[PDB]
Design a protein around this ligand. Structure first.
Ligand SMILES: CC(C)(COP(=O)(O)OP(=O)(O)OC[C@H]1O[C@@H](n2cnc3c(N)ncnc32)[C@H](O)[C@@H]1OP(=O)(O)O)[C@@H](O)C(=O)NCCC(=O)NCCS
Ligand SMILES: CC1=C[C@@H]2O[C@@H]3[C@H](O)C[C@](C)([C@@]2(CO)[C@H](O)C1=O)[C@]31CO1
Ligand SMILES: [Mg+2]
Ligand code: NA
Length: 448
């Protein structure tokens, strides 16, 4: 038995309600291999659960009442995490490995309804019902295997989910866990962010509390037609964007990263096409997800939810028209560790002080029409894991498609050669213009 209070940050209503999904594709040479794939995975899940029982638990809330959104804990559920095994080899609506390869692994070929064990959003059957900490699905497709992992978002951010998956891979291989891994997996969560003393409200929580007169909130489904698409950026395209940004930096900015440069290029490209439907004076906010473990001095192997955002406010015309380096400098300027730490402590403290957490959101004031809400998974280690399956490393690592959430965006785990894959969700008007935009298509290959 275990009763592990979630990270205070994981008590955010918008995180408690969603699952983060990721899919790994492997080629499978012969259908004779599938029974061993399954048994290897089941034995790995069993070994993992024996070492760290909470990975098989569920997230459960208690103390909910009027004006009290309660407190959630990881508590026992089943003996092992649930894996669903699904044979799609003869399903004509399923993808095939050759179809994938020919289309360049599009998001539309990773349909969460077909290849994931549970939806991202709390929509449909069984989303009212236990919330398992992690759920898995093995999908047999013609010539291949799609492994999908779902993580309960209050229990883990993608850095934490990567930590968990990485240890699952070790458990499948029957490789020992290190002492540091075991320690990180068992750190107390409710104390991992030290609170601020005598804190009511401050700039730490700017852009994170919903107000009646300000548009924003969690996973806003806009009443406009929208879609998801992947765009790939070659290692050369990425280095040319980084070069272009580096040449045009603000005087206050010594350097920017590859990630900064692409995030900036997208904000600029989005703002540029949006000029076709709104005035340049229209405000625009970039909300950028940031792993807060380094600022807090926490192990990269901590499997919980320790993430914040940085916020950047300008206007559509300014962002579109300024240099790439000006825009990348905006982003880099908010990454001082001391700042991230103070802001993160402030958010955690505000949450701790307030039984009613219903107004708190990482995108509290991000207007979907003009904003960019981006989370980069570029640094996570998913391209390296083989799960003892004998299939080699993943051929691709892609997020499943789900309902369009206007202005929400992700970077996939960076391919070892340096290729980036960006998932963009935009209203049709914006998406169509972006795809036809020469400055965009110079670097971005549309995949879908
Ligand atoms: C915010 C975030 C997206 C930024 O990622 P990032 O810019 O790739 O990583 P960092 O901020 O640590 O910076 C590392 C970069 O700075 C560069 N750098 C560090 N010191 C440098 C110096 N002395 N001179 C020049 N460049 C330097 C590195 O070369 C690297 O850039 P590169 O990847 O282009 O080679 C990321 O840290 C993050 O928190 N991920 C999101 C977590 C989540 O979503 N969950
Ligand atoms: C459905 C959905 C998932 C989201 O993904 C990334 C990150 O995992 C948290 C979130 C704040 C996030 C959480 O709400 C985002 O705003 C969202 O709507 C996000 C945009 O930064
Ligand atoms: Mg409320
Ligand atoms: Na050790």
């Amino acid at each position: 038995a275990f009763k592990i209070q979630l990270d205070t940050l994981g008590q955010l209503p918008g995180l408690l309600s969603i699952y983060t999904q990721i899919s790994l594709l492997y080629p499978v040479s012969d259908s004779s291999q599938y029974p061993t794939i399954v048994s290897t995975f089941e034995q790995g899940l069993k070994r993992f659960s024996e070492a760290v029982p909470w990975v098989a638990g569920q997230v459960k809330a208690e103390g909910i009442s009027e004006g009290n959104t309660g407190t959630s804990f990881i508590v026992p559920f089943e003996d092992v995490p649930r894996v669903v095994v699904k044979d799609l080899r003869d399903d004509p609506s399923a993808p095939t490995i050759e179809g994938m390869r020919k289309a360049g692994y599009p998001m539309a070929m990773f349909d969460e309804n077909i290849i994931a064990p549970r939806k991202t959003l709390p929509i449909g059957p069984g989303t009212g019902d236990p919330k398992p900490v992690i759920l898995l699905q093995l999908n047999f497709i013609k010539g291949g295997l799609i492994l999908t992992v779902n993580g309960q978002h209050g229990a883990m951010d993608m850095v934490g989910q990567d930590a968990v998956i990485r240890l699952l891979s070790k458990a499948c291989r029957n490789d020992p866990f290190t002492e540091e891994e075991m320690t990180a997996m068992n750190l107390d969560r409710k104390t991992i962010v030290p609170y601020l003393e005598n804190y009511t409200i401050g700039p730490e929580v700017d852009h994170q509390i919903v107000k009646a007169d300000v548009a924003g909130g969690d996973a806003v489904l806009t009443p406009v037609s929208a879609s998801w698409a992947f765009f790939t950026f070659s290692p050369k395209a990425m280095s040319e964007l980084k070069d272009a940004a580096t040449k045009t930096l603000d005087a206050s900015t010594k350097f920017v990263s590859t990630d900064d440069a692409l995030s900036a290029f997208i904000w600029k490209s989005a703002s540029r096409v949006r000029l076709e439907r709104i005035d340049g004076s229209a405000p625009t906010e970039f909300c950028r997800a940031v792993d807060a473990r380094p600022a807090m001095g926490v192990s990269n192997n901590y499997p919980g939810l320790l993430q914040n955002m940085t916020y950047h406010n300008s206007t559509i015309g300014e962002i579109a028209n300024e240099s790439l380096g000006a825009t990348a400098s905006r982003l880099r300027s908010e990454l001082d560790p001391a700042s991230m730490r103070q802001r993160t402590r402030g958010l955690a403290t505000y949450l701790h002080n307030n039984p009613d957490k219903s107004n708190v959101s990482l995108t509290a004031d991000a207007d979907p029409s003009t904003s960019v809400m981006l989370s980069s998974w570029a640094k996570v280690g998913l391209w390296d894991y083989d799960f003892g399956l004998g299939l080699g490393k993943p051929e691709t690592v892609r997020r499943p498609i789900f309902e369009p959430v206007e202005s929400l965006m992700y970077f996939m785990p960076k391919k070892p050669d340096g290729e980036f894959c960006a998932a963009l969700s935009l209203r049709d008007e914006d998406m169509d213009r972006l795809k036809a935009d020469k400055e965009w298509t110079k670097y971005a290959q549309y995949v879908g």
